[PDB]
Every structure is written in structure tokens, then in C-alpha cells.
Amino acid sequence: KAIPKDQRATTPYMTKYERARILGTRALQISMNAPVFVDLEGETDPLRIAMKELAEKKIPLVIRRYLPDGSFEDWSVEELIVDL
Amino acid sequence: DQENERNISRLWRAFRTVKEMVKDRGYFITQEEVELPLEDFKAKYCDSMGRPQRKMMSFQANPTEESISKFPDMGSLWVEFCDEPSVGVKTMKTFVIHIQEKNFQTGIFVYQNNITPSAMKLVPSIPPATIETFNEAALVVNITHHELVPKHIRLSSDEKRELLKRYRLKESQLPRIQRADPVALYLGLKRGEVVKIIRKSETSGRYASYRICM
């Protein structure tokens, strides 16, 4: 249904399932020969690269969180607080 | 003393309960008007020898001012008892009308042994006003006082239109309670009203919960 950046309600944190898919999803793309927005300090593993792409929060993705009723809340990996 | 000393003691408790219920129902009643001991009871609804005059127990009850803040259109109530152990389809036209004229809304009737299947089929014939039916042996004890049963609560057609909104709930997705559920009766719910079961939890002291009424 769409939810404004405001009136936001979900967790401010990142569900492990979220991270893991992102991480996976990214690495996949990296190995798909995709642009990598960080200095590979000499990394050759798409995951490892993704993990870096993440600890510098430079991953162009937005998790769209869907709610039982259909409406969703979009959260970027830039925002999402990565504790774990 | 024989076995009539008790047959009353029960009709007594059975009484108290209907007070409680009707007060919890959200009407006006005092703790005293309820905590009315046995002794004082006899001397009031008995005759000469010492038997019960039920047709003399009947009464009216009204909406506390509080219950008006939340429920505006909640009409006045009326309860009644019968000296007829085997009520019939004739004594009903008596009850049914008594209310249709006085113009009430809620009617509680307390039979003893049973009602004529010819009788009961007259309750849903005078809307808006609504009528209910309880057996005596039923009201003898207020279940809602039971260790396990936790307090429910009715919710105004707004506190609900909210509960939903605030949970993105589709009426049906809500946990349900049986129309004939003991407590559903004790608070006389209707197809639609929602109750807010608030129990005690070993996970977190309290734990809200809800239940619609099917």
C-alpha cells in the first residue's frame, strides 16, 4: 500500500535473515561481474567483498519489508543498524 | 430444617451472582447491595413459613455514569425470576411485552427447571431490545471468579475500529470467542463485539490479547 519514510514502525535493526540475504544477494551480483563501490584491498571473494561493501555501508540496496496486511516499509542498508 | 434450607441458600448465591454480573456488565450496583448476607436475605423475599418469593426478587438496574462515557446508547436493564419451576409459553408474553412498552433494551430472564420450546422462540421478535436466558443452577457460581479465568472486557465500536487499524487486522484474522462462551454470556456479547482478554504471563507479567465474537 506504501508507507511514508515517516510513520515508520519496524525494527531499526537488521534481521539476520535480512543481512544474510543482502550479503548473499550482493556477493552473487559481484560475481555476476557487477560494479563494486569499494576499494578491494585485495579481496577476491564476492562474499568477502560484499561483507566489506557492507561494513562501509556502501551497498545500493533497499529492503522492502512487507506487512501482513500488504503494505510495506522500505529500509536502506545505509540506514539499517548492523549490530548482531 | 429438612432439605429446603439449602434449596434457598443456592437461590441466594445464584442471586448475588446476577448482581455481580449485571454490575460488571457495566451497570449501577453497590458492593453492599451485593455482599447482602444470607440472614438479612431470608427476611425480605420469603413469606410466612420461610420459603422464597422469587416474583419479588425481580428488579431494574441502570448505566453507571462511567459506562455512558464509553457506550452512549447502552439502554437500561431488567432482570426477573419466576415462581414457576416449569415456565411456559404463556408467562412469556407477560415478560416480552413488559419491556416492549417500558422501552428498555436488555432483558435477563432466570428460569428454574426449563422453558417451553414454544416460549423461547419469541425473544428475537422485538428489536432493537434484546433478551437473554440463564438457568439458576448456572448462576449459582460466578465462573469469572475462577483461578484460571482472567478478566475479559467489552470494547466500544471505536476502541475496536482502532485495535484493527492499529494492527492492520481484517475482522476475521482476530482470535475468536464462542457466542455461547460462558464469559461471552456473562458479558452478553453480540456477533461482532470484541473482548480484551488481559492475562498473567510467566514470560512478561502481563499480556494483552483479544477475541472477536462469532
| Exposure on the CB side of residue B194, measured as CA atoms within 13 A | 23
Residues B100 and B183 in one domain: no
**Cα(A59)–Cα(A55) distance, rounded to whole angstroms?**
9
Into how many domains does chain B fold? 2
Instruction: Identify how the structure was determined.
Output: cryo-EM
Backbone angles phi, psi at A51, to 5 degrees: -55, -35
- What range does the domain containing B146 cover? 142-214
**Cα(A52)–Cα(A10) distance, rounded to whole angstroms?**
26
**Cα(B154)–Cα(B136) distance, rounded to whole angstroms?**
25
Strands (E) located in B36-195: 59-61, 77-81, 106-111, 130-135, 176-177
Last residue of a domain, one of B103, B124, B141: B141
B47 beta partners: none
How far is residue B182 from each of residues B172, B185, B213, measured CA to CA in Å?
A: 21, 5, 12
What amino acid occupies position A65? R
Specify the CATH number for the domain of residue B65: 3.40.1340.10
Dihedral sign from CA coordinates of B183, B186, B187, B188 = positive
Strands (E) located in chain A: 62-66, 72-76
b (16+ CB within 10 A) / e for A27-61:
bebbeeeeebeeeeeebeebeebbbbbbeeeebeb
Residues B87 and B190 in one domain: no
Q: How many CB pairs under 8 A join A and B?
A: 7
**Cα(B94)–Cα(B101) distance, rounded to whole angstroms?**
11
Residues B91 and B172 in one domain: no
**Cα(B106)–Cα(B123) distance, rounded to whole angstroms?**
11
Three-state DSSP at B175 gives coil
**Cα(A55)–Cα(B73) distance, rounded to whole angstroms?**
60
Please tell me which residue of chain B has the smallest CA distance to A68.
B168
Using a CB-CB cut-off of 8 Å, the residues of chain A touching B168 are: 67-69, 71
**Residue whose cell numbers read 571473494:** A45
Note if the bond before B117 is cis, omega within 30 degrees: no
Resolution, Å (one decimal): 36.0
Please tell me which residue of chain A has the smallest CA distance to B168.
A69
